[PDB]
Amino acid sequence: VSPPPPIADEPLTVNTGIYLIECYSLDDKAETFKVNAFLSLSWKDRRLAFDPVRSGVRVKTYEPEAIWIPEIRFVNVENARDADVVDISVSPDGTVQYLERFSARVLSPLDFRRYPFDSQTLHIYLIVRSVDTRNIVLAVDLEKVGKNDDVFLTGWDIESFTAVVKPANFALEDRLESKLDYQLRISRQYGYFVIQTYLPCIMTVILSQVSFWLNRESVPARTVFVVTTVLTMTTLSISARNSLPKVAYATAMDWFIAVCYAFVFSALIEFATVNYFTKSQPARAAKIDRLSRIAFPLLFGIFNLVYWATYL
Amino acid sequence: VSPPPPIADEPLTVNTGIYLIECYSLDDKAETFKVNAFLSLSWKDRRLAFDPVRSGVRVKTYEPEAIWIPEIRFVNVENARDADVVDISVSPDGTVQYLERFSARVLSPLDFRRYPFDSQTLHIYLIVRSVDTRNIVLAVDLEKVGKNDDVFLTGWDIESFTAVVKPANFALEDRLESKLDYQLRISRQYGYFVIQTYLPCIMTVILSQVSFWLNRESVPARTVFVVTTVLTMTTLSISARNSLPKVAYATAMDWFIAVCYAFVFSALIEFATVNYFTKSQPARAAKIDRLSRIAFPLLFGIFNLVYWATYL
Amino acid sequence: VSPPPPIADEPLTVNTGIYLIECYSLDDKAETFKVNAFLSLSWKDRRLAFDPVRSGVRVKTYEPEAIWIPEIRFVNVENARDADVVDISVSPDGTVQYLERFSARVLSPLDFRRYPFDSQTLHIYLIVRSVDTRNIVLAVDLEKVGKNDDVFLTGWDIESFTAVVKPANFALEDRLESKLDYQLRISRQYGYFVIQTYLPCIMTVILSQVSFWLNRESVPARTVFVVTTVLTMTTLSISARNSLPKVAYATAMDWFIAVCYAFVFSALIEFATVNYFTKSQPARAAKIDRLSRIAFPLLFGIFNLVYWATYL
Amino acid sequence: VSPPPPIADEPLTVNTGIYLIECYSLDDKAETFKVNAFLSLSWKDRRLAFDPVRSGVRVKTYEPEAIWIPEIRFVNVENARDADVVDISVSPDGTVQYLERFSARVLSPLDFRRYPFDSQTLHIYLIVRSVDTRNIVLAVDLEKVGKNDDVFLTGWDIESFTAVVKPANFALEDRLESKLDYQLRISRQYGYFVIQTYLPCIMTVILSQVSFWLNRESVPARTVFVVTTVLTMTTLSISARNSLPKVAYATAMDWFIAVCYAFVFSALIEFATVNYFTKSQPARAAKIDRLSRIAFPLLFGIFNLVYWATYL
Amino acid sequence: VSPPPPIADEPLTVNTGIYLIECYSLDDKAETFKVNAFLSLSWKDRRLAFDPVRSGVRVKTYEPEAIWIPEIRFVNVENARDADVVDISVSPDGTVQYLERFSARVLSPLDFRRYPFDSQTLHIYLIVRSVDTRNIVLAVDLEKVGKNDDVFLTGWDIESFTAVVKPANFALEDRLESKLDYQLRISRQYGYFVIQTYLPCIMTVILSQVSFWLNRESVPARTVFVVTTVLTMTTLSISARNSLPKVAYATAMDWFIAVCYAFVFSALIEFATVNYFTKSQPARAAKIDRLSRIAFPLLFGIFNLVYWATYL
Ligand SMILES: CC(C)CCC[C@@H](C)[C@H]1CC[C@H]2[C@@H]3CC=C4C[C@@H](OC(=O)CCC(=O)O)CC[C@]4(C)[C@H]3CC[C@]12C
């Protein structure tokens, strides 16, 4: 079969709508998420029109093989979606209403700069390619767009699911392409990380500062403190970066871990300095420890104040 | 083909039933589990009635392609289930009895607040969408609901598998939808975790208390004890939280590990205090150790008493 | 097509047989294994009989779509098997011999109580559901049961592949079901674990005992020994249990690791005691070390004797 | 159907083109990447010519099963691509223009010698096998080659996507084969590794040098420093090499880690030497530390200068 | 359709040949590898002969459904291969030449005794089952066997790809089976492991020997050295064995790691002995250190000489 003829020289618009049923498997490392939703299309094929009075039927349903149906494709997807046609109902005037349920693995990049205080805008791009008989354009039926109430992305807050009404039509390989942009905005729930990374870092800084209260003569103890806290800092750094894709930039968590490492390494340099001035000039070492015991936790407290105040 | 005509203006009810055959792959992190069971439907299509005398057959079986069959779908599923039709038998009055065997990956959220002493209610949602010719409603055939005796969840105890008789009918994209809620209740077997996390934590607290009995002059020894116990606590915490999804709340295990970390870090602060009072005021330090050796294991024992008494 | 008519009122028996061709991917954690074997069925459909003299052919082969074939299904399998029909040959009397080659992921629970000295009985459950025209029963053709010589389960010794002749017939959803039990018995090869887990534990106990021979005055050294051996014990314990499913009970390896941890922690308590009696009553501490140096390795040797003697 | 007849004795050329739509899952360890793009073919089958006036259509489109289509296969692919035919348009002269959208897992080796400062040229090899009736040759339609602007490799910069016009024709199993070479050039974004590995190594070298400023009499402290830095170096080496395939050569990161290990182990040998000359010849040890404190960081700075200057 | 009739009473031989196109994903742990190659068959079905003069065609091509084709199966494969028929050309005398392109996951056991200096012989087993009308036997057409030059196993050197000409015929379930053995011999590239495991082990032995040059009075330092090197050895052992399947035997790497562990633990026993003889009989301890400093690195050098000389 072939596309319906134009009543003049006008483009055929397909009213689209997506209703999210299930939303799962948001992969930060793969920058993909799995979706299972309704796809609804609606166009006008006057060849299928009929008299509502002579025909005692009010709708009349067809099978996908019976009538022409537009080839609608997703762009930012890994494999072609798995779709099951739910219903096809033509109107007495020829208005075809098509409804399927599909599942797909969507590939949408994420911006981890404000991670884990980041919000994302996942994109689902519909697209249709014009035929030689007629140009096809996509539209948005807001009545057919939405998401179920029990849709959940564990670890995220789902903000909204909308669509950009004005489609992007463009030339591609000598044919017209019409693209729609469905947008799922979310905001990450950072609490999980506060006890996953932020607490080990803060407690490691505190543990490193405890060394300033040990006697300056007991070198091995303070050495254990400093060294173990520095290595612990490095381990937390790598471990934390192992959850993200190979992004080139640095996240907010990256900055917090970096400042913590600065404090711990500062405690190391301090321990080395004091140990260097212990035999000769014991007054200097005593002053260094005495001042550090007040400055370190103070600067650290101010830092946490500015940080959590900023990212919350 | 199209749905059977209403004998007046009455909804077509489809009597459903699920019989769990196999139950496996309950993923705590993905909050999904794989199910393999029987799906049984039963309705009345008077068009299929027949004379039991003229027709020498008492039942008569059809092929799925021959007669109208309702489109029954699962909601909380990742992909459309894989089903093999087992049998289709019509009654002389037109009562179609349909039986298939399906396997599906069900997506059901979990509540880890009482983890690992938690009980869960896995949900399997049936749903059918009404056609324009007639509304379809779902029902539950208690005779067709159940589960095999050899159904096992390697880490769980299976409590029961029932279904909510009253379906949830609602409007979706201008059509009526009927949803049924099958519930599989389970309770986790916590023993695995007692030796996976709880024992390492308790033994780390005890090991941390062993430092109080070492001579106050041998500083490096007590330093090794305290530091290693604190780092061990941090590692056990992270490792333990790595088994769950990025939930925002805290589990019971989270509380136990948190209190253990409180005891260990308290032992650290104690070591720092005593080391600070060792040269000047040795009597004070001696009092500190003497009291700690009795308070720490006592408060810890009381805590374990309240905790294990509460969560069991 | 429909099932062959009963020559009176007798059940139709299908002679079954499985020939293991390939056996791989035995997953201890998933309690599943992958199989690839021959499935052979044989029944009597007198409608297919023919004259061996008038018909110059001795066998005559059909296509699956041509004749009725019983719907045979596996029970303890995750998805429907992937089968390729190999041959279908009818006899002059109507004896259909059907042969396919299938691969399936079988789900069979394991008993890790004697792990890693455990033996298992993997189960493959065949089943057939009776039709309304005739009851179908399963049988076992010992001539068609077996396994290839080059079948290997890396890390296991394959003992036998047999079948329980008497099938389990029972009522299910108002129809008769016939179940057969094929059993693949295997015994694990424990050597891999002796150098994977048992050696690290034994060597850790020895290393812990080495501290008793260090001078009682060098406290930090003995502290390092004891602490590192205890942490090593915990790490080996958790690491070892990470290979099994979340079973509630304890394995033999669990017992060995537990006794090792008891010896190491006992060495810790000993170090604390001696360090506590070093200044006052040095004779007591000296006696403690002197006795431990002989008692610890002796009790440990006896333990290994009873253990390896028992589980070997 | 069979290939179109040659208008004389000429090979049939198929004008090919790939338009990258999606590019993802570039696996360094598997040396594979997943691609999703348009494949466009174009040939001349005069048997399909038609009158544009008698036939009221100006192009008129067919189904894949209707007309002869050349068997085009990818070479460096793991499984046969999953393709959905988008359009087939014939011209009045018989010019078939074919368009599909495919996804495939391409297998292209990588050169990690300059890793992570490496650039790669991923290859996609098309091929067609000539039939006995006519030889088939592949060509490149530059109008049909390109890639979408929103194509992204989460860890790479995409340089260009071109194709080698002149195909490689050769004999294979007594038939002619024509191969085309599409090339996607990329350059890795190394920043991720600077904070993933390079910083831990640099900070570990610095931390190892901090030991030279500790008193020569406090042996245990310097021991802790040296040992922990050496073990940290080894762990970072192994961990770093765990990201690449089992390549036989050494990467640039391998060289950086190797020099760092040389500096750290050199600090170990230095500590051993000084500790050996501390009691006898204290002036010598003092000279050793005094010189090392200036030589080590200087040679390290020069090394970093030459290295980062070279690889950037 | 049915097999071609025998011109007398002779077996039908099918000339087979495999041409490796792609070879990848050699999994040492799973003992499987993925292959993608050409499969070429050639037999004689006299029913298809034709006159080359009356028929104006020189070859004439058929569809798989048109003519009888032998059921060729792989044995040591996990799932049935995915094959796409490339060409079918019959000769005027009836010689059918069949060509497909397949991909399959081959399962072949490996011998890790000489690992990582091991060479393997991967097996691909063809097999055909004789029908009741005629016995079928497999043969090898050397013209159709080979492999592309750009075939690579990222961690191996590919030696050759040949086939055993004489097939293995045997009885199976009352029918004749013919099996062919294609052999791909390879030799592992061990360099990756020299810097992955061998270097950490050697440097850890050296690090353990460094303790002999430290003063006998600084007990804690030597304790740190010995303990850390022993634990490092154990970790390298387990980590190394984690790359192989649960084999019961020991590899060459296993032996090297074992000897290294013997040297390190010997250094531990030495430190304990000297520490035991430090106060009383200091001359004995001094002699122990003096001799060890020369014997240990010498015995280690001799060992490395014999080892690397043997396995290379
Ligand atoms: C106190 C006065 C007398 C001298 C202080 C000099 C230091 C403050 C300088 C010398 C080395 C510098 C460090 C060089 C490297 C790093 C590593 C970097 O840490 C990380 O690895 C980040 C990890 C991550 O982001 O996940 C943070 C900055 C820091 C500590 C620098 C902070 C500033 C340091 C410690």
Ligand SMILES: CC(C)CCC[C@@H](C)[C@H]1CC[C@H]2[C@@H]3CC=C4C[C@@H](OC(=O)CCC(=O)O)CC[C@]4(C)[C@H]3CC[C@]12C
């Ligand atoms: C009032 C001045 C003079 C003394 C202040 C001392 C405090 C800074 C110390 C005493 C008790 C310590 C607390 C003891 C226990 C913990 C629980 C710990 O929580 C966890 O580790 C959670 C782990 C998990 O969630 O798995 C966070 C640090 C904290 C609050 C410690 C932070 C440091 C505290 C508050």
Ligand SMILES: CC(C)CCC[C@@H](C)[C@H]1CC[C@H]2[C@@H]3CC=C4C[C@@H](OC(=O)CCC(=O)O)CC[C@]4(C)[C@H]3CC[C@]12C
């Ligand atoms: C305090 C003095 C006066 C008497 C000595 C008492 C000790 C012999 C007790 C105190 C704590 C007890 C320990 C408490 C808990 C356990 C854990 C238990 O299980 C495990 O270690 C886990 C092993 C596994 O499951 O794989 C082994 C015995 C052990 C170490 C106990 C051994 C006996 C211990 C050391």
Ligand SMILES: CC(C)CCC[C@@H](C)[C@H]1CC[C@H]2[C@@H]3CC=C4C[C@@H](OC(=O)CCC(=O)O)CC[C@]4(C)[C@H]3CC[C@]12C
């Ligand atoms: C300077 C003179 C007076 C005494 C030299 C004694 C040591 C400093 C020498 C003896 C053995 C040498 C080692 C022999 C082999 C190597 C392996 C080499 O390989 C790597 O670390 C590669 C790391 C990677 O591939 O990622 C690093 C240098 C090192 C340790 C050498 C460093 C210098 C060592 C320790």
Ligand SMILES: CC(C)CCC[C@@H](C)[C@H]1CC[C@H]2[C@@H]3CC=C4C[C@@H](OC(=O)CCC(=O)O)CC[C@]4(C)[C@H]3CC[C@]12C
């Ligand atoms: C002479 C007696 C009175 C006191 C000293 C005895 C030790 C020197 C003996 C007792 C146990 C023996 C150990 C038994 C087993 C092994 C394991 C072996 O290495 C391994 O098996 C590690 C596993 C691997 O290589 O994969 C190295 C020698 C060693 C430590 C032996 C070294 C010699 C040991 C320590």
Ligand SMILES: CC(=O)[C@H]1CC[C@H]2[C@@H]3CC=C4C[C@@H](OS(=O)(=O)O)CC[C@]4(C)[C@H]3CC[C@]12C
């Ligand atoms: C995190 C930082 O970067 C700060 C926070 C507190 C600061 C320290 C406070 C007190 C002193 C004592 C002084 O000794 S003196 O008698 O020679 O003047 C030398 C400088 C020193 C060690 C400061 C160095 C910088 C800090 C570590």
Ligand SMILES: CC(=O)[C@H]1CC[C@H]2[C@@H]3CC=C4C[C@@H](OS(=O)(=O)O)CC[C@]4(C)[C@H]3CC[C@]12C
């Ligand atoms: C989990 C907790 O937080 C508890 C567990 C055990 C408790 C300690 C038991 C004994 C003492 C000695 C007493 O005397 S003093 O001369 O140091 O002031 C001061 C209080 C102090 C340090 C308790 C503080 C609170 C704990 C750390």
Ligand SMILES: CC(=O)[C@H]1CC[C@H]2[C@@H]3CC=C4C[C@@H](OS(=O)(=O)O)CC[C@]4(C)[C@H]3CC[C@]12C
């Ligand atoms: C695994 C075990 O449970 C055994 C292994 C070795 C045993 C110890 C050997 C030596 C002594 C010294 C003796 O000292 S006394 O003068 O106070 O009586 C008290 C008893 C004590 C601590 C034994 C207790 C039990 C063991 C810890």
Ligand SMILES: CC(=O)[C@H]1CC[C@H]2[C@@H]3CC=C4C[C@@H](OS(=O)(=O)O)CC[C@]4(C)[C@H]3CC[C@]12C
């Ligand atoms: C990267 C390297 O490998 C260099 C960097 C600094 C160098 C050291 C500087 C000073 C001295 C003191 C001298 O002692 S002496 O009084 O006997 O001459 C002996 C040589 C020694 C240990 C050098 C050895 C080589 C280095 C470790």
Ligand SMILES: CC(=O)[C@H]1CC[C@H]2[C@@H]3CC=C4C[C@@H](OS(=O)(=O)O)CC[C@]4(C)[C@H]3CC[C@]12C
């Ligand atoms: C790898 C090994 O196992 C060997 C390699 C070198 C050997 C050592 C060489 C020298 C001596 C001195 C001698 O002292 S004595 O005055 O009592 O005789 C006692 C024995 C002792 C410690 C040897 C023990 C065994 C070794 C550690």
Ligand SMILES: [Cl-]
């Ligand atoms: Cl799609």
Ligand SMILES: [Cl-]
């Ligand atoms: Cl479904």
Ligand SMILES: [Cl-]
């Ligand atoms: Cl099955």
Ligand SMILES: [Cl-]
């Ligand atoms: Cl392909």
Ligand SMILES: [Cl-]
């Ligand atoms: Cl196959």
